[PDB]
From a paper:
The 70 kDa heat shock proteins (HSP70s) are an abundant family of ATP-dependent molecular chaperones, involved in many cellular processes including protein folding, prevention of protein aggregation, modulation of protein complexes, and protein transport between cellular compartments. HSP70s bind to extended hydrophobic sequences in newly synthesised and partially folded proteins, in a manner dependent on a cycle of ATP hydrolysis and ADP/ATP exchange. HSP70s consist of a conserved N-terminal nucleotide binding domain (NBD) with ATPase activity, a substrate binding domain (SBD), and a poorly conserved C-terminal domain which terminates with an EEVD tetratricopeptide repeat interaction motif123.
For example, the ribose 2′-hydroxyl forms hydrogen bonds with the side chains of both Glu268 and Lys271 and the 3′-hydroxyl interacts with Asp234 via the mediating water molecule, similar to the interactions of the ribose moiety in the ATP-bound HSC70-NBD/BAG1 structure. Likewise, the tricyclic adenine replacement is sandwiched between the aliphatic parts of the side chains of Arg342 and Arg272, similar to the adenine ring in the ATP-bound structure and both moieties form a hydrogen bond with the Ser275 hydroxyl. In addition, we found an intriguing difference between the HSC70-NBD conformations of the adenine/adenosine, 8-aminoadenine/8-aminoadenosine and triciribine fragment/triciribine structural pairs. By contrast, in the structures of the ribose-linked ligands, this loop is in a more open conformation in which the carbonyl groups of Gly201 and Gly202 interact with the α-helix at the back of the ATP-binding site. This conformation is similar to the one observed in the ATP-bound HSC70-NBD/BAG1 structure, in which it is required to provide space for the phosphate groups of the bound ATP molecule.
Residue numbers in the entry:
A (entry chain B): 149 to 261
B (entry chain A): 1 to 381
């Protein structure tokens, strides 16, 4: 009803951040597939550990990239009237947080004991 | 690549800066990320050696193998009070090799150790490459700056860092002397001039009193607070918002490292906004336990939260005047150095102490040392 050209600028920044989240989430998906591969592979217990702990640097790099997205989102100031922008920002933060929760479960499954 | 000019390098504790004198003016050179300052960070990974912004950006990922603060170790003995006190806070290992400290890391799967001047040489090599990428010419000659309180051993170790980095160190000059040269205080007509250099960074606070008589610089005194900087002002804001969140929501965010980091980053940026505006707004969705944190802070509240810290910057000023055997009325020029001198309240306190005397602040305070060094590098070329 009162959609402004100024909000289109904010929606564009959020769309560029959504594309960045989708790139990091594809890396997380590859990490999940490689983890399953090691778990359902023929590696002896000792070499499995090296393979699982080799995923650690990668998982930590995924967490960090998600943290940097959150810091970029946190630079935004959205007036109350920019309802669509506030919804897209909130939806995007919750999505990054759900992926960070998945990264945390991977971290609790590698380099253990 | 053709042979290029001589550069001025401010080799800093947490950040370094490189400048060049060309077409009658100094140009502060931006790095590959477009930043006019470069982190004095070196990281050792399983495959490569990262320097500068690339090393600082992966610090969370590789805390033990990411080295910084090598300036606090350079030219010092292992048993130095400074070395013993500072290593209690570093995430990387500091070992003793025949009385000399060495940083110990895992580099390409092997345990390796480096002397502080070897780490500083890697930072200098990065500064050399930043200049070379901008100029499109080979850079060999440099003027490198050191603190006025550095002894013979710390000065020599810095020159050795320059030599290992493949630089021809034209001169090692004091950081307060470099700031005074930037403003041409040695060229002003008149009698000897008493200059006060007020340096406030992210972690260190240094006050220096220089006398310039017939183009000769003489350090009369140095004072300061080695652990006082912008980071202390961020901490006060973080504590204020943690308390605010507790008052409103009855929840303690301080044990969630990621919530504290999101808050800290927002605070540091809000602090910078307060140097030009009287208010800064912060909006952080789902900060802790799904609660959105939308707030603001005025300059007045930021100043109240840091009142003791700001006022406290005047005690090393009085200490320096006492040691230099000078009254405040005998100070001809005051020079601002360091990012934190941009804070309006600090400028007001310093100006009121000198009964309304104008401050030399037109040159970016983060770049003033590099600026004076580039001028000196052009003079010696
Ligand atoms: C406006 N404006 N612009 C800056 N570029 C800057 C850097 N700083 C601080 O100086 C330190 C750097 O050694 C860190 O603690 C920075 O937060 C600042 N404090 C206040 N106002 C500032 C800055
Ligand atoms: Cl430039």
């Amino acid at each position: 009803g009162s959609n402004s050209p100024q909000e289109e600028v904010e929606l564009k920044k959020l769309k560029h951040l959504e594309k960045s989240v989708e790139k990091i989430a594809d890396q997380l998906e590859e990490l999940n597939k490689e983890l399953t591969g090691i778990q359902q592979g023929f590696l002896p217990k000792d070499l499995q550990a090296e393979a699982l702990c080799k995923l650690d640097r990668r998982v930590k790099a995924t967490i960090e990239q998600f943290m940097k997205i959150l810091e970029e989102i946190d630079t935004l100031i959205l007036p109350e009237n920019f309802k669509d922008s506030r919804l897209k920002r909130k939806g995007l933060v919750k999505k990054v947080q759900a992926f960070l929760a998945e990264c945390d479960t991977v971290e609790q499954n590698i380099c253990q004991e | 690549m053709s042979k290029g000019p001589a550069v001025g390098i401010d080799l800093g504790t947490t950040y370094s800066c490189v400048g060049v004198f060309q077409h009658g003016k100094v140009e502060i050179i931006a790095n590959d990320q477009g930043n006019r300052t470069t982190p004095s960070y070196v990281a050792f990974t399983d495959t490569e050696r990262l320097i500068g912004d690339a090393a600082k950006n992966q610090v969370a990922m590789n805390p033990t193998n990411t080295v910084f603060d090598a300036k606090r170790l350079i030219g010092r003995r292992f048993d130095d009070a400074v070395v013993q006190s500072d290593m209690k806070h570093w995430p990387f290992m500091v070992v003793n090799d025949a009385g000399r400290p060495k940083v110990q890391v895992e580099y390409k799967g092997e345990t390796k150790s480096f002397y502080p001047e070897e780490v500083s040489s890697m930072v200098l090599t990065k500064m050399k490459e930043i200049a070379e990428a901008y100029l499109g010419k080979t850079v060999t000659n440099a003027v490198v700056t050191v603190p006025a309180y550095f002894n013979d051993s710390q000065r020599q170790a810095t020159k050795d860092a320059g030599t290992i980095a493949g630089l021809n160190v034209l001169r090692i000059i004091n950081e307060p002397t470099a700031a005074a040269i930037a403003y041409g205080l040695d060229k002003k007509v008149g009698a000897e001039r008493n200059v006060l250099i007020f340096d406030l960074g992210g972690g260190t606070f240094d006050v220096s009193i220089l006398t310039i008589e017939d183009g000769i610089f003489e350090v009369k005194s140095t004072a300061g607070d080695t652990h006082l900087g912008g980071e202390d002002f961020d901490n006060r804001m973080v504590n204020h918002f943690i308390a605010e969140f507790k008052r409103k929501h009855k929840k303690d965010i301080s044990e969630n490292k990621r919530a504290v980091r999101r808050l800290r980053t927002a605070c540091e940026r809000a602090k910078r906004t307060l140097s030009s505006s009287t208010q800064a707004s912060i909006e952080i969705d789902s900060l802790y336990e799904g609660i959105d944190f939308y707030t603001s802070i005025t300059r007045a509240r930021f100043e109240e939260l840091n009142a003791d810290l700001f006022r406290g910057t005047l005690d090393p000023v009085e200490k320096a005047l006492r040691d230099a055997k000078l009254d405040k009325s005998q100070i001809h020029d005051i020079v601002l150095v360091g990012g934190s001198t941009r804070i309006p309240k600090i400028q007001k306190l310093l100006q009121d102490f000198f009964n309304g005397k104008e401050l030399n602040k037109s040159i970016n305070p983060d770049e003033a040392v590099a600026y004076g060094a580039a001028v000196q590098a052009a003079i010696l070329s």
